[PDB]
Design a protein around this ligand. Sequence first.
Ligand SMILES: Nc1ncnc2c1ncn2[C@@H]1O[C@H](COP(=O)(O)OP(=O)(O)O)[C@@H](O)[C@H]1O
Ligand SMILES: Cc1c(C(=O)O)cc(-c2ccc(Cl)cc2)c2cc[nH]c12
Ligand SMILES: O=C(O)[C@@H]1CCCC[C@H]1C(=O)O
Ligand SMILES: [Mg+2]
Ligand SMILES: [Mg+2]
Length: 259
Amino acid sequence: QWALEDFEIGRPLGKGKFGNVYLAREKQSKFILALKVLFKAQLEKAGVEHQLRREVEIQSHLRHPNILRLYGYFHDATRVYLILEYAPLGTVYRELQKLSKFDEQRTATYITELANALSYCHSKRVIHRDIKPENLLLGSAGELKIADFGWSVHAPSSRRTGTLDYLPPEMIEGRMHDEKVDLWSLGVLCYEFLVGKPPFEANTYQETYKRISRVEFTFPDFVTEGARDLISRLLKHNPSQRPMLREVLEHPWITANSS
Ligand SMILES: Nc1ncnc2c1ncn2[C@@H]1O[C@H](COP(=O)(O)OP(=O)(O)O)[C@@H](O)[C@H]1O
Ligand SMILES: Cc1c(C(=O)O)cc(-c2ccc(Cl)cc2)c2cc[nH]c12
Ligand SMILES: O=C(O)[C@@H]1CCCC[C@H]1C(=O)O
Ligand SMILES: [Mg+2]
Ligand SMILES: [Mg+2]
């Protein structure tokens, strides 16, 4: 059992939907970590308290070098506190903003780390459902770590939940979905890492929705044939058509540019 009194709080690491994440140090051990602070009132207002227990329950039981660790949790009269592994090199989101786009080698490496973490996840029938650059953190060696299990569930799920940019058609239409949702988000990520923006991006939610439903996207000329092949294979309206993660890892373009 932990209390807030056990940690020295540092700077904010990032903004959340239901609070903020802070850098922190555990007083007795000097263990540097991240504290994801959530407000009870806002969670209650949204009726997401059940889903927060699920984020904790799912993430605490995962052990993989490419998945962010959740060490524990505690709560007080006003807040819920998630004790996370601190990712010192920040988000893939911030790296993409400064670099504009990644080269094929950096993209393929990230796709490999993601595919390994996802393979491990799906082995436990865990669907992340919120795979996006702001939820992909970087370890001390620059290795990708899947974070933010806030929308995580066990497959299959029929459970409903913007922006729609990373969501597959079946999730967008409120239909039943499985592990294939993360294979779709992988294709969206691969495209965004190479192009600098996701394939269904738009000025409005309405326009993005139509693009995802139609699987309506085009590649800029600089996107190679091997990158086009893997992305096109991953972005299939039909979840059944989406390849297994094993095939993603053995894709010629992945093996040639990773790691
Ligand atoms: N362990 C961590 N180390 C470093 N930065 C983090 C960590 N966890 C979260 N962040 C930062 O805080 C942001 C919000 O955290 P996240 O868990 O994704 O919250 P939410 O569910 O509100 O989206 C992230 O996008 C990232 O910028
Ligand atoms: C009022 C209250 C309690 C409580 O006192 O039992 C617990 C939680 C809560 C704690 C931990 C986790 Cl992981 C999830 C929910 C939440 C969330 C919103 N209101 C809450
Ligand atoms: O961790 C959270 O802030 C939330 C818990 C409840 C479900 C949604 C989730 C999120 O936005 O990631
Ligand atoms: Mg997040
Ligand atoms: Mg979240």
